[PDB]
Design an enzyme around this catalytic site. Structure first.
Site, PDB file in Angstrom:
ATOM      1  N   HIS A  62       0.834  -1.219   0.000  1.00 15.82           N
ATOM      2  CA  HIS A  62       0.000   0.000   0.000  1.00 15.82           C
ATOM      3  C   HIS A  62       0.854   1.248   0.000  1.00 15.82           C
ATOM      4  CE1 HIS A  62      -3.380  -2.667   0.713  1.00 15.82           C
ATOM      5  NE2 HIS A  62      -2.769  -3.154   1.812  1.00 15.82           N
ATOM      6  N   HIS A  92       5.459   6.663   6.834  1.00 15.40           N
ATOM      7  CA  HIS A  92       5.126   6.238   5.496  1.00 15.40           C
ATOM      8  C   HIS A  92       4.615   7.453   4.728  1.00 15.40           C
ATOM      9  CE1 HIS A  92       1.301   5.957   7.635  1.00 15.40           C
ATOM     10  NE2 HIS A  92       0.812   6.439   6.471  1.00 15.40           N
ATOM     11  N   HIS A  94       1.996   8.943   1.265  1.00  7.20           N
ATOM     12  CA  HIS A  94       0.971   8.813   0.280  1.00  7.20           C
ATOM     13  C   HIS A  94       1.350   9.748  -0.868  1.00  7.20           C
ATOM     14  CE1 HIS A  94      -1.636   6.811   3.278  1.00  7.20           C
ATOM     15  NE2 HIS A  94      -0.996   7.589   4.123  1.00  7.20           N
ATOM     16  N   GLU A 104      -3.388  13.406   1.314  1.00  9.60           N
ATOM     17  CA  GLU A 104      -4.683  12.956   1.899  1.00  9.60           C
ATOM     18  C   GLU A 104      -5.407  14.162   2.450  1.00  9.60           C
ATOM     19  OE1 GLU A 104      -3.729   9.404   4.276  1.00  9.60           O
ATOM     20  OE2 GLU A 104      -4.500   8.397   2.462  1.00  9.60           O
ATOM     21  N   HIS A 117       3.395  10.705   6.819  1.00  5.38           N
ATOM     22  CA  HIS A 117       2.713  10.419   8.105  1.00  5.38           C
ATOM     23  C   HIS A 117       3.741   9.818   9.034  1.00  5.38           C
ATOM     24  CE1 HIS A 117      -1.436  10.362   6.046  1.00  5.38           C
ATOM     25  NE2 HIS A 117      -0.998  11.554   6.334  1.00  5.38           N
ATOM     26  N   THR A 196      -6.138   6.476   8.029  1.00  7.90           N
ATOM     27  CA  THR A 196      -6.660   6.684   6.661  1.00  7.90           C
ATOM     28  C   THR A 196      -6.614   5.452   5.838  1.00  7.90           C
ATOM     29  OG1 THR A 196      -4.619   7.407   5.723  1.00  7.90           O
ATOM     30  CG2 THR A 196      -6.004   9.149   6.742  1.00  7.90           C
ATOM     31  N   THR A 197      -6.197   4.335   6.396  1.00  6.43           N
ATOM     32  CA  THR A 197      -6.278   3.040   5.766  1.00  6.43           C
ATOM     33  C   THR A 197      -7.046   2.109   6.696  1.00  6.43           C
ATOM     34  OG1 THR A 197      -4.134   2.412   6.799  1.00  6.43           O
ATOM     35  CG2 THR A 197      -4.129   3.175   4.464  1.00  6.43           C
TER      36      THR A 197
HETATM   37  N1  V90 Z   1      -2.315   6.819   7.124  1.00  6.00           N
HETATM   38  S1  V90 Z   1      -2.252   5.847   8.355  1.00  6.00           S
HETATM   39  O1  V90 Z   1      -1.366   6.166   9.515  1.00  6.00           O
HETATM   40  O2  V90 Z   1      -3.579   5.586   8.833  1.00  6.00           O
HETATM   41  C1  V90 Z   1      -1.529   4.391   7.511  1.00  6.00           C
HETATM   42  C2  V90 Z   1      -1.842   4.172   6.172  1.00  6.00           C
HETATM   43  F1  V90 Z   1      -2.745   5.211   5.634  1.00  6.00           F
HETATM   44  C3  V90 Z   1      -1.270   3.334   5.365  1.00  6.00           C
HETATM   45  F2  V90 Z   1      -1.646   3.250   4.064  1.00  6.00           F
HETATM   46  C4  V90 Z   1      -0.368   2.460   5.911  1.00  6.00           C
HETATM   47  S2  V90 Z   1       0.267   1.213   4.837  1.00  6.00           S
HETATM   48  C5  V90 Z   1      -0.863  -0.178   4.956  1.00  6.00           C
HETATM   49  C6  V90 Z   1      -1.719  -0.188   6.174  1.00  6.00           C
HETATM   50  O3  V90 Z   1      -1.429  -1.378   6.812  1.00  6.00           O
HETATM   51  C7  V90 Z   1      -0.088   2.627   7.316  1.00  6.00           C
HETATM   52  F3  V90 Z   1       0.741   1.707   7.811  1.00  6.00           F
HETATM   53  C8  V90 Z   1      -0.613   3.527   8.124  1.00  6.00           C
HETATM   54  N2  V90 Z   1      -0.311   3.583   9.454  1.00  6.00           N
HETATM   55  C9  V90 Z   1      -1.112   2.896  10.546  1.00  6.00           C
HETATM   56  C10 V90 Z   1      -2.334   2.024  10.128  1.00  6.00           C
HETATM   57  C11 V90 Z   1      -2.338   0.520  10.150  1.00  6.00           C
HETATM   58  C12 V90 Z   1      -2.513  -0.148  11.520  1.00  6.00           C
HETATM   59  C13 V90 Z   1      -1.183  -0.572  12.149  1.00  6.00           C
HETATM   60  C14 V90 Z   1      -0.528   0.468  13.078  1.00  6.00           C
HETATM   61  C15 V90 Z   1      -0.938   1.937  13.004  1.00  6.00           C
HETATM   62  C16 V90 Z   1      -0.325   2.565  11.782  1.00  6.00           C
HETATM   63 ZN    ZN Z   2      -0.830   7.487   6.155  1.00  5.92          ZN
END
Ligand code: V90
Ligand code: ZN
EC number: 4.2.1.1
Length: 258
Positions: A62, A92, A94, A104, A117, A196-197
């Site tokens: 992702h 990470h 986007h 986002e 992020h 956001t995921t």
């Molecule tokens: N934007 S965000 O922080 O919500 C987020 C993404 F958008 C992502 F696209 C990703 S990559 C795939 C998700 O597993 C991400 F790790 C996070 N971070 C978290 C979400 C996944 C749950 C595991 C720990 C929290 C980090």
């Molecule tokens: Zn993110």
């Protein structure tokens, strides 16, 4: 699973597997700068990254993520809107297929080329999995990227991406200093929201910095050479891995400045 960013599995589908996608405090949002009210009760953010221990970088299908050792209080965020201490877990990005998209959050409907992020969890919950279950469990520092001059502190990340082109690939990535991804100013907006995921958990205090960082066209090109697919499936470039803005509903966005 099968969630992703395409027509058949993208953001408009997520609600079937994750009904909170239509909840009351979903992220991202548009930041209407004229409506966000300066809050003179907010504090300066405290970003303490001097002891950060990056461990590894990972293509999770992702995005790519730089992970840290969060098994003690090394890199921590506190202050701003936060009570208590939040440990840095991972960062990470986007980004878009074209520079006019990729962020986002939006600012008066403007989209940035990308968004970083930095994900932190509240140490009062002991582990990130517990923290995901709490309204104040995570704090995510969001930083916009625009395309212009290179960010020298990003080059080490960009130079390893060809070793993690496909989903499931990872590489040691030690000694990375996330301080080099920050802009000069820590002026921010903040509001209560979500991941956001998927699972889209409503556990995040968002802290979005007003000042974007610039990255070069060459840097962002390297993001766009990543693949969503794993080693040996048709090639699908990892681009447009952003969720668009969600309804603000009964929320206020507060500004730390002006
Ligand atoms: N934007 S965000 O922080 O919500 C987020 C993404 F958008 C992502 F696209 C990703 S990559 C795939 C998700 O597993 C991400 F790790 C996070 N971070 C978290 C979400 C996944 C749950 C595991 C720990 C929290 C980090
Ligand atoms: Zn993110």
């Amino acid at each position: 699973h099968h969630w992703g960013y395409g027509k058949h599995n993208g953001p408009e589908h997520w609600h079937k597997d994750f009904p909170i996608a239509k909840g009351e405090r979903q992220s991202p949002v548009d930041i209407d700068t004229h409506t966000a009210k300066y809050d003179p009760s907010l504090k300066p953010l405290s970003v303490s990254y001097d002891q950060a221990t990056s461990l590894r970088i990972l293509n999770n299908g992702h995005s790519f993520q730089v992970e840290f050792d969060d098994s003690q209080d090394k890199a921590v965020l506190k202050g701003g809107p936060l009570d208590g201490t939040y440990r840095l877990l991972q960062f990470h990005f986007h980004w878009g297929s074209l520079d006019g998209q990729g962020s986002e959050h939006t600012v008066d409907k403007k989209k940035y080329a990308a968004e970083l992020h930095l994900v932190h969890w509240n140490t009062k919950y002991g582990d990130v999995g517990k923290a995901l279950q709490q309204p104040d469990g995570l704090a995510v520092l969001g930083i916009f990227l625009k395309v212009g001059s290179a960010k020298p502190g990003l080059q080490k990340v960009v130079d390893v991406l060809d070793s993690i082109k496909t989903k499931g690939k990872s590489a040691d990535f030690t000694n990375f200093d996330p301080r080099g991804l920050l802009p000069e100013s820590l002026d921010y907006w903040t509001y209560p929201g979500s991941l956001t995921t998927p699972p889209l958990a409503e556990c995040v205090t968002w802290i979005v910095l007003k000042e974007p960082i610039s990255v070069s066209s060459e840097q962002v090109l390297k993001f766009r050479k990543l693949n969503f697919n794993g080693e040996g499936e048709p090639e699908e470039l990892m681009v447009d891995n952003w969720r668009p803005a969600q309804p603000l509903k009964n929320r206020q966005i507060k500004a730390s400045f002006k």
